[PDB]
Design a protein around this ligand. Structure first.
Ligand SMILES: *[C@@H]1O[C@H](CO)[C@@H](O[C@@H]2O[C@H](CO)[C@@H](O)[C@H](O)[C@H]2NC(C)=O)[C@H](O)[C@H]1NC(C)=O
Ligand SMILES: *[C@@H]1O[C@H](CO)[C@@H](O)[C@H](O)[C@H]1NC(C)=O
Lengths: 49, 49, 49
């Protein structure tokens, strides 16, 4: 499961609105609004994937 | 001969190298005159850590 | 501050007996990068130091 160039095929949910359910499944890629400002588009300052 | 009493020698310590805490209340004044007679003011202090 | 020290003799200043309002610090977009290595940046307002 490892490569010299880095097996970036594996990801994890760094940000979510709250704690998850038991056995919860989500493949959401929606950008998390980490900053107090509303976030539109797909990127921006303090807008974290 | 002068009826004056003011702080002149800060002969308490030599080095204050690595300080962490300071507490300063608002400036005021206290009587440093050499009051005579029986002891009128009674100050009771309790310290515990 | 009008003038900062340099990396050869980085100046160190103490923070004590204050309320560290990180809200204005984080919400200020004038900063370029902001990375906390030990704890979550958003929760510094809760865990007391
Ligand atoms: C507070 O600062 C002093 C010096 O600024 C620290 O004492 C130094 O400690 C290092 C390593 O422990 C020594 O190499 C120096 O010779 C020490 N200098 C002096 C003047 O003592 C002290 O450790 C600091 N206090 C804390 C809690 O970190
Ligand atoms: C009292 O103070 C004055 C002025 O500071 C000084 O000239 C005088 O010498 C002092 N008194 C004595 C007895 O030295």
């Amino acid at each position: 499961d490892s490569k010299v160039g880095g097996n970036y095929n594996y990801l994890y949910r760094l940000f979510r609105k709250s704690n998850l359910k038991p056995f919860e499944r989500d493949i959401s890629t929606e950008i998390y609004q980490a900053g107090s400002t509303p976030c539109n588009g797909v990127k921006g300052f303090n807008c974290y994937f | 001969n002068n009826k004056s009493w003011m702080e002149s020698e800060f002969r308490v310590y030599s080095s204050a190298n690595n300080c962490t805490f300071e507490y300063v209340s608002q400036p005021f004044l206290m009587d440093l005159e050499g009051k005579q007679g029986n002891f009128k003011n009674l100050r009771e202090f309790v310290f515990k850590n | 501050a009008t003038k900062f020290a340099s990396v050869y003799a980085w100046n160190r200043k103490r923070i004590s007996n204050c309320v560290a309002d990180y809200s204005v610090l984080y919400n200020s977009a004038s900063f370029s990068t902001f990375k906390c290595y030990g704890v979550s940046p958003t929760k510094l307002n809760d865990l007391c130091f």
